[PDB]
């Protein structure tokens, strides 16, 4: 960075860093289901008397 404060001024900065991390988690689940359905045969489908 450069600028003007009581005359000209300048500054050069360097930087480095190193981070670590760890974590846990727990997950639950529940569910239901329904199902209906039809079947048929086209041809030979009906009986009579």
């Amino acid at each position: 960075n450069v600028g003007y404060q009581n005359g000209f001024t300048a500054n050069v900065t360097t930087n480095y860093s190193h981070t670590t991390d760890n974590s846990t988690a727990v997950q639950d689940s529940n569910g239901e289901s329904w199902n209906t359905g039809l079947s048929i045969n086209k041809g030979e489908s009906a009986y009579i008397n």
């Binding site: 003007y4 009581n6 005359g7 000209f8």
Partner: protein, 49 residues
């Protein structure tokens, strides 16, 4: 003040002890591109004898 056959002086050297630079907009730049020029004017001086 620099005598016969020397180097010139400086104005607003970047140091501890200066003043700000003088800015020019686009219009006065265009006027310098045209035929008007810059006059230096010494209002009043100060010395001793």
């Amino acid at each position: 003040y620099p005598k016969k056959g020397l180097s010139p002086l400086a104005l607003n050297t970047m140091d501890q002890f200066s003043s700000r630079l003088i800015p020019i907009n686009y219009d006065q730049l265009k006027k310098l591109d045209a035929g008007k020029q810059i006059k230096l004017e010494t209002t009043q001086v100060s010395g001793n004898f």
